Each structure stands twice: as structure tokens, then as C-alpha cells.
Symmetry: C3
Subunit: 425 residues, 3 copies
């Protein structure tokens, strides 16, 4: 047993609070392999490897049939870290023994795993074996937040629709439904947003979250400048690019003000472009333009010193800016490893630089971003092996820290910081 | 001995199809050290280290004399990977026993190597000693493609002149001569390009290739929009920036249409600026503005689902974008390590990230970009050592793959994908 | 015979440690080069910006009428949040080497005893000498104000470099114009007079052993030549006491910058460019803890400069890690582009290693300046250089000793050239 494996074993014992997921609290764990293999990580990759979208997303085939088809394309993917998560979770959760998933062994695994997951206490078994105490949700702004344990599945207000999509009649309607306000004037939109916050806070929300395009640049926007764009949206007109920009800035800034008023952190996921690949599988269409800078957010950071902004960056090149900005701005926090940057090749240097330059209390190591509970463990395990390596190399060896001291840093990054950064409203 | 070495030894034995080079099939190998040491890899560095251009490119000196002068400036270069290629090549092909080329040992090498290279079968000896089975060319659009084995030296259509240089009188003349068309109208220019494709397909061509500046952003261009700029070019006008951009887009898009029709992949080398250093040696003047994104190619990737785009990026920071785009677009392939990115410090993390996140069938390991055959081996060997390292660490160790399974991955990256991606028209 | 706890990398580092250095860039005040107490070390922005970033209010740190000892005490209270940082590693190692500090960390429990002891040590008549000797420093390049007389200190020990930022960016300021007028004796209201005045500064610095000009530049800066005619308006406006529009300001800056390059050309002086800083991005930070950057830059915007001045060496530091690869490429092609150390936010092991690694394998060995301290006080030199030597030792052993089968001696020689040799040949003097 190598020193790194031992340090990792210590990290493995740490019970976690996942500060960011897309779990459906009403259907948190999977019911069959289709919930796992049918998830976009794999369908986008099967597709990317040459499987027609039509084959994967064929109308009116069973979940099991769909899994069969995807498996046929797994041979092109057996090198990916994504497929490694899959084999490791299957072995952990289902007792899967083979080193790879093939057209010859998939069905027996499907049938078997399905039985295991029909057990009444399946969700609890996953949480238990994944060292998860609690998971942050990403709730739609109109989510009733009822029907589940808000202390285990912790609400977070997703604001993307309000900030970027008031242009859409369906978005306005949902807002009207949720708040009862006619939000065609700034004062009323502000009232509406205020009601969403009170609603989220009263159900134990611990954060707001948003995904932002690389071009976004927040500024203050007065009510007068907001009123034309907002009136156009509600009158049903198509907003010009400038109107749309002004309105999104108005909404975004208003949300940051409510975060300050309610002492909520505002998670910013920066750098994503939606629907770059127009013919991709469901949830496999978003990419990014790397040409972004946190400098674009200087007005926000300066204007809201009492709002913590846990920031994830999509582009790997952006990490070093994030380090410098978390290093200087007391309200800027480095938050996990997001999406396309969420692989060992990029995690290691990112995790490494953050631990050595950012204060230890401004560093959230990791979140799962999972849609089903079973994906939590393999991704957190991947992160723990990387973290164990950095801790051992740079702290145990580099600084002569005891394993204990190094593991204590590990615990703060995985868990301690989540507790103090997201203390509750 | 070393586990990495053993894995490298197995990769060394894989016979290659070099998927991108600038070989002249009628003068494929060198005749003297002037063809080697006088190549821009070494003159640009000697000049960079402080040797005057006027000394290196003095008119009325022989190849041997020029070699002599470059050698004087090599003491400043013994650290460089480029000079490692040079020494290794000399050891392999010329029996060179010294650790470096110096004023006191170069002449003996020059006379001995020139003697070896004058041998009738030198070309064949190099290919055999390089594990090279076939090599892609990059031919001018008017290359007759005649007089050589097109299965050994495989034609590829170089499109740079058509896309960016119709402003040059001589380019228009060459195109008129080659196609018989009067391309001053859009429709005719399209037919002309079609005839270039027919010519190349008749000679077993396997791809198109182009190098692109950072500002290039492909979009469709209508005949009405193209007619203005095209007429101006054929009228001997100096095109405005916008005219030039419209014409280049029109030609580029037209070419991709033909790639789709003939089932030819379109190799894109993205991000070069020509003549950044205006007083540099021949072929040592180009650099780059790293402020580019594959996002600017989204229209292209979406509009040509049946064209494979093997992409190379110049800036190291663009690699992470490349891995993401090859991850999502079925038709985006990661293609080798280009130019300034073609050194171990950058190749390793780029090679590493590609293997772990991109499907194994969308990853072309390496091409030589060589101008003379002797440069193929040292460059490929540098690559094999990095890949061996990545395979051992991330697959053999990281995933508990057997050496065999890892070598099989390596073989696919080095050779297998070249066969499937460039199958022929 | 070797210590068992010593790796081959440690052995290589040990040989690097014995290289007597000339620091090619600092901000030492030659009249107060070393610290008098921990207030000088702990009170420096490395630690105050971090303490503040970790949650300590600036009002607490920068409270008026608080002694240096009390300020240290307050900063120590907040070091718990920082014991992971490389900056804190510098501190501990610093205190160990100079003050005999034996503890693995600095806490409220043990700081006062260290403060007291270190203040006694630093009050020794030969403290400055002691630090230099223990730091393997032979000489240090200063960054002098343009109006420094360069006569109040030993210029062979503290080597003058002309700080140009104020001339290039701040003629808008009455205080800068007045200092220039006092220094040179000129009404620089006209381009010709201003050039002559700048010329006198050069003549003054060169005759006092100056080895470089230096400047920090913002990401938007794009040097081009500027005619006297184009410059006369903005210059006149600055001297009239007017407020320069953005355009006047940018023209004037380009003009002064290009002028300075021209003098560098004339005197064969290298011009250190530190590229990529934005001032006062964080508006409520601690003193010297407000500047950040915008990564969206390219050396491509400097192309005119590099092309127009082949006889000027431009040692370049890039602020953003992403820009390093572009620097490697430009140093690789332009004879007059030189890679210069690891600057500011890039000055941490996680970034130094790949940046150092790529420079060694692609840039000619004579165009690579390994490191400078940027130090404000002498005690910061050693821990930062030691941090660097450790990275360099790793790179040298892995890529040269193992990678190219070099003897350790040959690898160390490359190390010596990078640390010291290139400093001597790049900054030989006018
Ligand atoms: Zn998410
Ligand atoms: Zn090429
Ligand atoms: Zn400095």
C-alpha cells in the first residue's frame, strides 16, 4: 500500500455534503441501467464516436433496448475516464466483475442491477456507500420545494431562466404562476424575484446558482434603462441584442442584491455556450468559447462585498485567473471542477495551484454535478485520488506535513469549507 | 528494462502511415546535411540565439559552407528538443557517435553523410529505418500528381492559396491554367474547384488540408455576396478586409461542400499568423495570436456532418477546447501536435487529456509535418516516448490495463485511426 | 556518501544552492535594504492581501496608530487560514534560515517570542551583510525612480534600472511632470524637449551603471510608433493642466514608450517588459493588494515593437500562465525576445514548473533568465529563489539528467547559465 493510497483511504472516510448536483429529490437514485448509461456523458460520447442520434434516441424503444444500443458503441469509449466511472460504479453498486461492459455481458448486468435497485432502501444504500450526508439541488425558480427532506436535498435557486430567458413566453408565465405578479415593470419583477427568495429561504435554500455565457459582463442597470427592454419582453416583442443584454444585466444584478439581503452565496458557473452542436443528443449540445476573463466580473465583486461568489470556470485556461481572483477578492471562492475541466488531466494542475495559492478557507474542492445518485461516488473517488496525490506530493513530502495534517487540509477542502461557505440563509 | 521503455519498444515496432507532411515525392530524402541543418527548425533557432540572418542566408555560399556557419551557433541550442532530433537522426541514419555537432566534428559528418545519401537506395533505407509505410503529401492545387506511387506518397489537396490568395495574380493564373475555367463569377469558381477535386480523386487523394489564421470564422456565403469580392479580385483590385474575408469564406465553404461530396476529410491547422517576425530566416517568420476559439468554427462543424475535420491547434491553450469539441462533435477529430506545440512539455498534457476524454477512434496521435524523410523518425520517436509514458501511467497503472491492451490503444492512436479516418475517396 | 533523506533532485538542488546570484529584478530600497522587524515581512502585501482575502477586514490590518508589533500580532491571528499557502512556506523557511525559528508554523502562541528575537538579530550592525551572505546574493538590480540621483549608494552592489512606468503612463499627474522638470531642467511641453529630457535620464542612468529599463504594462497596451506631430497635442494638453481624453492619453503613452525603446536601442540597454497587469481591480484591498489582470492578451500586440528594435533585448515576464506558451514561441523566434522569470500570480510552483520546463526545452539556453525575487526587503530573496531552485532542480533532473542522459554536472551547468550566466550576458551594461 503506497503512501498516496493510504492518504486516499483517509480521504475516503470523509462524509460529504455535495454542494452542487442536479438530483431530482423525488427520484434521486436510478431504477435501471437506462438511467445511468442513458445519461448524456455516455450518449454524447457514443454519438460522438459515430452512433447516429436516431439510434440512441429512437422513439418508443424500452429503456433496456436503449442500453443495448449504447453498449454496442462502448468499444469506442473504453479509454475514457467517463467509462471508467461506469465500470467502477457498476462494481461498487452492483458487484459487476468484468473489466469492461460488452454486448456479451451487459444484459446480465442490466437484469441484476435492475433487481438491486428495486429494493425499497436502494437510495439509502447508494447514499451510504457513497459517503453522502446531503446533496445541494439545483431547483427551477418555480419549484414548489415540497415533498422532500430539504435538509438532505438542499434547495438552491437556479436563476438562468430569469436572467437570460424572459424573452420566452413560457418563462414569463411560470414566473407569473409562481409569484402572482404582472412583471412587465421593473418594480413588479423585483417584487416577483423577492418572493422567490423568501420562498426558497423559507424552505432552507443555501445558495443561488447560475451558468453564464463567456460574453456576459455584469454591470448595474437603473430601473429606467430596464423598463424598455422588460416592457418589450412582456408585450411579446423580439428583443434586440442590446435590449436583451441590458435586461439580463438588470436581472442578474437584482439577484445579486437579493443574495446580499438574504446572506446567500451566489454560485457562478462561468463560460458555457448553449446549443453549439445543434444536432446533438439531449443535453449533449453545449460547448464553450474559451475567450473569457474574470476581469469581466470586477464590478460585481466590488459592488457586493457581503456576497460570497463560489466560482467554477469551464475553460481549463481560466483556472489560473480564478486562483488569482480568489487569492485577492475576499468574496471570490474557487468551487470545484466543472464539466469539460472535470477530468484528471485538468483537475490535477487546477487542484494543485488552488491549494498552494488560495487561502485554505476559500477553496471548495469538489461537487458531483450528478443527475442520479449513483454517479456521485465514482466522480468523487476520481477527485479524491487526485487530491491525495497533490496533498502527498506538495504537503506531506513538499512541506514535511504529517499525513494527519495533510488529511486535515483534505477534509477542509472536501467538507469543512462547504459548511462555512453555505451556512444557510 | 524500465516499464515505460518496454511499452515504448512495442510502440517502436508499429509501422506507420504518416498522415501529414510536406514531402516532395521526387526529392523525398536529403542529399546532404544542408537539407537537414539548413531547414528552418535549426536556422530560426540559430538566428534566434543571435546569429545574423545575413550570415546564415548569405548568397554565393555552398550548402557545406552554410552548414558550417549554422554549426557555430549550435552551442546555444544543445538544450533544445529540436537539437535532440538532430543528434538522434544523425546517430540513426549516419552512425554519428557524438553527443553534439560542433565546429570540430561537423565536416567529417558532412562528408560521410553526403556519401551515404548519394546511394541510389537512400530513400528506401530511410523509409525502412523509420517504420514508414506511406506518407501523406500536401500538394499545391495545380500539382500534376504524376510520376510517383500515389499509395506510397498519398496526395492531399492543399487549399491555402485558393482560400486566402486569389488576390495574387499568379494564383489566379495557376487556377485558370489548371481548370480551364474563368473563375471571375461564383458559379464558375465552384466548378473550377470541383475539377480540382476530380483531379485529386483520380490520383488517390485522401484529404484536403489548410492552415488558418486566428481571426478566420467560416460562414456560408451566397453567390450574390461572393460576386462582388470575386469580381474585384479578378479585376486586379486590392481587396478591402471585408471583401477578402467574404471571398475566403466563400471558397472555404465551397471546398468543404466538395469534401462532403467526395468523402474527403478536411484537415484544419488553426491559429497561425504569417510574417509576424518580418526579418526572420526563410520559413522562420510565422507566429500566432493565441486569442482564438473553436467556437468560431461552429457553423462549419454543424453544416457538414459528413465531413471529418481532423483539427490541429497551434496554441497549447486551445488543446482543452479541442478535446471538448472532439468530445461533442462527431465530425471533429483531434489531430496530432502542431508546430510550436510540438515539444514534449506540451505534447504530454495534450496527449494525456485526449486519451482520457476523447473516444479512442477520434484521436490521431501524430504526424511529422516533415519536409525531408530523415525528420520523420526523430519526431515520431519523441512522440512515442511521451505516449508510452501516458499509456503506462494512465492505462497500465491508472486503469490496471495489461501492457497489451495499452499497446493496442497506442496502435489505434498511431495507425488504426489513420486507416479509418482517411479511407480514401 | 549521501544522506538517505536526500533524493537525486535534492542533490541537484544542493548544487544549484551554491550558485552565487545576481538578482536581475527587485524593488530594494538601497538605504533600507533589509528588514528591522517582522512588521517589514509580515506587514508586506504578500501576507496582508492573503489575510484580508481570508476574511480579515482591512481596517483591522491597516488601523492607524498601531505599532509594527501590534500589526504583526493581528496578522498572525489570521495565519491559520493561510498555513497551506506557498507564501506562508516562504515565511516559515525565511524565519528558520535567518532567525533560527524551529517551529513548523507561526501562531498566536509563538509569534511574540519570534518577533522579539528577530528584532534583536536585525538590529545587529551587519544584519544586511548577514542576509546577503546567507542568501548567496552578490548584487541586486533595483528599480529606481527616474529622478533618483544614483549617488547615495554603492551602484556595483545595488544596480540601477530605470523605472519608466511614470513617464509612460502618468505625465497626466502634476507631480510626475514637476519631478521630471526638476530632474532634467526642461519644459517638456513639446515632443522634442521631452525626448531630450528622457535622453538626459538615460545618460544619467548609464553613467551610473544602470543595466536595464523596466516597465509594467496593461493588457490593452499595443505599442506603435508615434510622430512628434501626433504627440504634440496630448503633451501640450498634459502640461496645460488639462484632463487627457482616453485617446490623447493612449497616444502620449505610446509616444513616450516608443521614445524609451529608441533610447534603449541607442544605449544597448535591455527593456524589461512585465506584461498584463490591471491596476486597482479590487478597489477596497490592502495597500499594494488591489491589482489583478485580464488574461485576454497576446504578444502579437507587441509585434511592431519587436520588429522595429532588433538591437534592443526585451526580457519579458507574462502575468497569466496561459501566456507562457506564447512567450516561449516568441522567444523562440525573435532574437530580441527573452523569457524573464516568473512574475507575481504566476510565481508559484504549480505554474513555474510547466513554464520553466517548456522554456528549457524550446528556447535557446542563452535567452532564458530563470528568476528574479521582485523583493522589497532582502529577507524575501532567499525563500523565493529556493522555491525556484527546487522547481528547476526537478526539471533539470527529469528532462536533462534522465531525459537526455546528461551528467549531473552538465545539467547543473545549464542551471547555472539560467540563474546567473544569462544575467551577466543579457545585462552586461550599456
Ligand atoms: Zn451543474
Ligand atoms: Zn504542415
Ligand atoms: Zn517588480
Amino acid at each position: 500500500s503506497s503512501p498516496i493510497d493510504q492518504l486516499c483511504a483517509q480521504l475516503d472516510e470523509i462524509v460529504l455534503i455535495d454542494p452542487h448536483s442536479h438530483i431530482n429529490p423525488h427520484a434521486a437514485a436510478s431504477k435501471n441501467l437506462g438511467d445511468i448509461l442513458g445519461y448524456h456523458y455516455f450518449t454524447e460520447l457514443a454519438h460522438s464516436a459515430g452512433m447516429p442520434r436516431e439510434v440512441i434516441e429512437a422513439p418508443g424503444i424500452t429503456a433496456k433496448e436503449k442500453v443495448g444500443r449504447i453498449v454496442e458503441g462502448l468499444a469506442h469509449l473504453d479509454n475514457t475516464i467517463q467509462v471508467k466511472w461506469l465500470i467502477e460504479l457498476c462494481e461498487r453498486f452492483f458487484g459487476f466483475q468484468d473489466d469492461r461492459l460488452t454486448p456479451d455481458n451487459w444484459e446480465a448486468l442490466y437484469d441484476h442491477s435492475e433487481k438491486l435497485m428495486s429494493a425499497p432502501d436502494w437510495e439509502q444504500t447508494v447514499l451510504q456507500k457513497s459517503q453522502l450526508e446531503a446533496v445541494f439541488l439545483t431547483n427551477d425558480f418555480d419549484d414548489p420545494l415540497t415533498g422532500f427532506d430539504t435538509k438532505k436535498y438542499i434547495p438552491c435557486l437556479r436563476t438562468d431562466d430569469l436572467v437570460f430567458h424572459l424573452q420566452k413566453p413560457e418563462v414569463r408565465q411560470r414566473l407569473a404562476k409562481a409569484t402572482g405578479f404582472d412583471c412587465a415593470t421593473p418594480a413588479k419583477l423585483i417584487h416577483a424575484i423577492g418572493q422567490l427568495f423568501t420562498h426558497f429561504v423559507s424552505h432552507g435554500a443555501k445558495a443561488c446558482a447560475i451558468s453564464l455565457p463567456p460574453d456576459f459582463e455584469p454591470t448595474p442597470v437603473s430601473h429606467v434603462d430596464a423598463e424598455g427592454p422588460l416592457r418589450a419582453a412582456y408585450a411579446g416583442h423580439v428583443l434586440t441584442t442590446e435590449q436583451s443584454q441590458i435586461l439580463s444585466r438588470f436581472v442578474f444584478w437584482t439577484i445579486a442584491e437579493f443574495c446580499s439581503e438574504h446572506h446567500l452565496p451566489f454560485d457562478l458557473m462561468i463560460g458555457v455556450n448553449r446549443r453549439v452542436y445543434e444536432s446533438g443528443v439531449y443535453q449533449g449540445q453545449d460547448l464553450f468559447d474559451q475567450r473569457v476573463s474574470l476581469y469581466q466580473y470586477r464590478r460585481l465583486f466590488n459592488a457586493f462585498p457581503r456576497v460570497k461568489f463560489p466560482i467554477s470556470v469551464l475553460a481549463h485556461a481560466s483556472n489560473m485567473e480564478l486562483v488569482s481572483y480568489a487569492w485577492i477578492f475576499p468574496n471570490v471562492i474557487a468551487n470545484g471542477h466543472w464539466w469539460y475541466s472535470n477530468i484528471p488531466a485538468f483537475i490535477e494542475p487546477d487542484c494543485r495551484s488552488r491549494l498552494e495559492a488560495i487561502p485554505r478557507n476559500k477553496n471548495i474542492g469538489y461537487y458531483s454535478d450528478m443527475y442520479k445518485l449513483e454517479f456521485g461516488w465514482p466522480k468523487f473517488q476520481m477527485y479524491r485520488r487526485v487530491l491525495a496525490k497533490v496533498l502527498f506530493e506538495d504537503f506531506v513530502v513538499g512541506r514535511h506535513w504529517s499525513e494527519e495534517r495533510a488529511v486535515e487540509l483534505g477534509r477542509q477542502i472536501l467538507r469543512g469549507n462547504v459548511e462555512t461557505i453555505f451556512s444557510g440563509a
